[PDB]
Design a protein around this ligand. Structure first.
Ligand code: ZN
Ligand code: ZN
Ligand code: ZN
Lengths: 99, 101, 59, 346, 86, 100, 102, 67, 82
């Protein structure tokens, strides 16, 4: 099959590994997997579009971690935004000064 | 003595409804609303500074929001066979709008 | 969702578990207010006026 | 008129009792509870109310001495809960000192310092008994008042926790020493076979805490059991009558007892409950009722908090039971007035 | 430092202000407990809008809240305001 | 020098709409007919609201359109009310509509 | 003559164009500056709506070009009722005029 | 059959996928369940327990969908 | 035959949906009302859902057209797009 070759990307192989890191024996169906895939795509497009507006407002043609930080501070409500900004900052600081 | 002319509670009410529906000026006083905006802003960031047009835009949006909320509150009051709005009506309007979150 | 699955005596997350997981949390319900999850249903939440009075008169 | 009350004493040679040290007024109703001097009637009424009131943000919502809202500073030594305004410090000891006090978080307050004579401040010996007399004259309610424990005559707190652990909380609150386990808190999950002899063997107790199960109904035992056993072991742990010893208690209900059990608990503990709401995340989060004899705990309830909204929250929490942690943080704050009674571990 | 903390400005929203906003809303008769609830709802609405607008000011590296940040904060909440620049 | 505005018989600037499409990061390429079509659509949506605002001004015995006239022009028509349902017009007020 | 006293960035608008359209539909009616700011914000708002809708319509079909067809489908989605049915006729007439004006 | 008859007006001779019709049914049933939630609240607010068309009209008029 | 598919929505279907919605009692005039509202709620989606199918130059209305027509109206549906 060389003409039947079109691989649609997803987030199944990642959300499965995050689930095994959180609950080491709990599984998940494929319908709930598609709901988690649509959730990741939804929140991705929300934060990307909000950061694109936050770049266009300040006449800047570059998205960095600061626009994503303030987009997370706008879109996520309450303590969820604070924990997501803490986790994001910790991951960026771990990423920059690594091997 | 029957000299001082006094109206009914359903005359001056409808007269001021017709008066304040045909008007476009702001109804909340500007300086107490500005002090309220500054007080609410002091919790998020210290040593802020407002443009006058920003406070006027906040006042336009907040008065339009409250007039729309009192329209749905009036519909909730009439639906319960009453002409008196109550906090039940404001809670029902903000529940049906989906703003109890 | 793993806590909602463990409550339901299941070791596999069905969309009912994601529905109960998001809608019971208040910040995730604020995040996904205008969002429908397929094969979810709704929360088992009955109002306190539609129930018959299962009480006893003190007098 | 705040720079004049420092002039009426030094120059006019007047008695501190003859001037209201709060708002600078010349009219004096009574004598001030903490320090020597007089207090005008409105400030007197408000001052008593302020002590009852409990604030999440700071040790005191309004100022101790003059009862002002703003200009709040924190006490240096962490084993003290006193808070004074900037205007009291400026007016009494001298201008430009309040800024110096507020500038550090390790500045020893007036009650922690060896000498209590700062220049215009006088301490009272055995002040707590006089303070009880102050409550007796006008407060219209004789709230449970145990003698205050001096810093020099301070004891290690002996804690008995029943049905719920607070060692993490008290450790965070500085009541239990970390790193060293002499055993100043005994957690006892099962108390059905506890006897007076056991409590006498466990060493004498000063604070006995109990609390209801968390909202996930972990155990299959009726919630009144925690209350009734708490009362029993409480009475056992009370010191021998005719002994100058402090005994504090606190039973905490996370809306797991109905109105019947609520009245029962209120009757045995001989006071009305204390409903505490938590920080709104849009509407309402959770709430907790507390009985105790610890100062400024009864006034902690907020009149805005309704019963029906509380009933709805209870029924949405009981049936849903998403979170199942005992609200340790909710009941963490209420021990804060107790800070002046036992030793604090920083 | 040199900033007195503003307080009790929710009572600056007077009873005849909520009366006139109920006249424009078409309400014929207002109960006594309307005014506290209306102050509370207006306070929560200003909390949401200023919570967005101060964050727009934060990311812009300024210390002045503009009218454009108010229009962005309202257009984000699905309440598009005209007359101040879109 | 013949501008693209009068080349299509329109009034809104074709060039400004073209550079605001190319500036707004909408797509990688922008077609030639797209700013002409969008300028025509915006010109029709402007002309309808200015017609209804001019009629509301003539009813109010005024020769200047105030924001009250734009408020009465948008809220009275039901298709423009459906278009601008979540839109507040400043200095506008509300409709004089009293329940029976 | 005095010139270039205070260097200020020229903020673009649509004010003179809305003025031209108003003089085409009402030859004697004026308009205030506040209502002119409202009409400017309206043109910016509807421009952003149709451009963003056309951007989504282009991205959904894996095409990186916005032609008049994407704007036409965005107008048919955004304008309710007769507004779309007249705006599509006006836009198609304008594109037909623009293509055959040489 | 309802979705096909409603789709007859906008275009002649459509085709649907099974997933599309199931997605329409999921969203439509969820919309109606939320609508009967607000309808039931409107019925309780008028000291009743039986819902009426006044309640559905009030819920859709406060949601801002009367157009 | 080609007119009574709005009555294909039956009385027990609206009964079960209102039981899920937590309604204790239903009047006899609800069933004529709801069939109106549901019908309007289909049109506002399908008018959009055909239109994406118009722009894609297809004849099949896919699940992605339904997801995009609901996402446009702020009713984002999960579990039908990969
Ligand atoms: Zn005084
Ligand atoms: Zn101290
Ligand atoms: Zn003071």
């Amino acid at each position: 099959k060389k003409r039947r070759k079109t691989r649609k990307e997803s987030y199944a192989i990642y959300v499965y590994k995050v689930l095994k890191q959180v609950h080491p024996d709990t599984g998940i169906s494929s319908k709930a997997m598609s709901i988690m895939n649509s959730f990741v795509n939804d929140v991705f497009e929300r934060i990307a579009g909000e950061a694109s507006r936050l770049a266009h407002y300040n006449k800047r043609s570059t998205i960095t971690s600061r626009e994503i930080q303030t987009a997370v501070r706008l879109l996520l409500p309450g303590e969820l935004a604070k924990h997501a900004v803490s986790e994001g900052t910790k991951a960026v600081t771990k990423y920059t000064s690594a091997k | 003595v029957k000299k001082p002319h006094r109206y009914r509670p359903g005359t001056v009410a409808l007269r001021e409804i017709r008066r304040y529906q045909k008007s476009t000026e702001l109804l909340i006083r500007k300086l107490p609303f500005q002090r309220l905006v500054r007080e609410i802003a002091q919790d998020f960031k210290t040593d802020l500074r407002f443009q006058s047009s920003a406070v006027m835009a906040l006042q336009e949006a907040s008065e339009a929001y409250l007039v729309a909320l009192f329209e749905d509150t009036n519909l909730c009051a009439i639906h319960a066979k009453r002409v008196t709005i109550m906090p039940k009506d404001i809670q029902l309007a903000r529940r049906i709008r989906g703003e109890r979150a | 969702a793993g806590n909602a699955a463990r409550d339901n005596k299941k070791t596999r997350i069905i969309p009912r578990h994601l529905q109960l997981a998001v809608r019971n949390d208040e910040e995730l319900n604020k995040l996904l207010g205008r969002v429908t999850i397929a094969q979810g249903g709704v929360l088992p939440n009955i109002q306190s006026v539609l129930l018959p009075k299962k009480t006893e008169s003190s007098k | 008129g705040r720079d004049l009350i420092a002039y009426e004493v030094k120059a006019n040679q007047r008695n501190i009792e003859d001037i209201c040290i709060c708002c600078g007024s010349l009219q004096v109703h009574t004598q001030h509870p903490l320090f020597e001097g007089g207090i005008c009637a409105p400030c007197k009424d408000k001052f008593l109310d302020a002590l009852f009131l409990y604030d999440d943000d700071g040790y005191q919502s309004y100022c101790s001495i003059c009862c002002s809202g703003e200009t709040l500073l924190i006490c240096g030594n962490p084993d003290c809960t006193r808070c004074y305004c900037f205007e009291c410090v400026d007016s009494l000891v001298g201008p430009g000192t309040s800024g110096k006090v507020h500038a550090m978080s390790n500045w020893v307050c007036y009650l922690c310092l060896p000498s209590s004579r700062s220049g215009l401040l006088q301490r009272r010996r055995k002040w707590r008994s006089q303070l009880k007399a102050f409550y007796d004259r006008e407060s219209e309610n004789p709230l449970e008042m145990f003698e205050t424990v001096p810093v020099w005559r301070r004891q290690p707190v002996r804690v008995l926790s029943l049905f719920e652990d607070i060692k993490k909380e008290l450790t965070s609150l500085g009541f239990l020493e970390s790193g060293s386990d002499p055993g100043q808190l005994k957690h006892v999950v099962d108390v059905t076979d506890t006897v007076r002899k056991d409590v006498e063997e466990w060493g004498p107790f000063d604070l006995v805490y109990g609390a209801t199960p968390p909202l996930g109904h972990t155990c299959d035992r009726p919630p009144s059991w925690y209350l009734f056993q708490f009362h029993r072991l409480l009475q056992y742990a009370r010191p021998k009558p005719g002994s100058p010893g402090p005994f504090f208690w606190m039973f905490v209900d996370n809306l797991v007892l109905n109105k019947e059990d609520l009245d029962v608990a209120s009757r045995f503990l001989e006071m009305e409950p204390v409903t505490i709401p938590d920080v709104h995340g849009g509407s309402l989060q959770n709430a907790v009722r507390v009985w105790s004899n610890i100062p400024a705990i009864r006034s902690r309830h907020w009149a805005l908090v309704s019963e029906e909204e509380l009933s709805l929250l209870a029924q949405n929490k009981q049936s849903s039971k998403l979170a199942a942690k005992w609200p340790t943080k909710l009941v963490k704050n209420c021990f804060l007035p107790l800070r002046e009674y036992f030793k604090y571990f920083s | 430092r040199h900033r007195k903390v503003l307080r009790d400005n929710i009572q600056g929203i007077t009873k005849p202000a909520i009366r006139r906003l109920a006249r424009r809303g078409g309400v014929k008769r207002i109960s006594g407990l309307i005014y506290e609830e209306t102050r509370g709802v207006l306070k929560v609405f200003l909390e949401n809008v200023i919570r967005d607008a101060v964050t727009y000011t934060e990311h812009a590296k300024r210390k002045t809240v503009t009218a454009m940040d108010v229009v962005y904060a309202l257009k984000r909440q699905g309440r598009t305001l005209y007359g101040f620049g879109g | 020098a013949k501008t693209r505005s009068s080349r299509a018989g329109l009034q809104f600037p074709v060039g400004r709409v073209h550079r605001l499409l190319r500036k707004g990061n909408y797509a990688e390429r922008v077609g030639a007919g797209a700013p002409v079509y969008l300028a025509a659509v915006l010109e029709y949506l402007t002309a309808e609201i200015l017609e209804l605002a001019g009629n509301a001004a003539r009813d109010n015995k005024k020769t200047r359109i105030i924001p009250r006239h734009l408020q009465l022009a948008v809220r009275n028509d039901e298709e423009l009310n459906k278009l601008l349902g979540r839109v507040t017009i400043a200095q506008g007020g509300v409709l004089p509509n009293i329940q029976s």
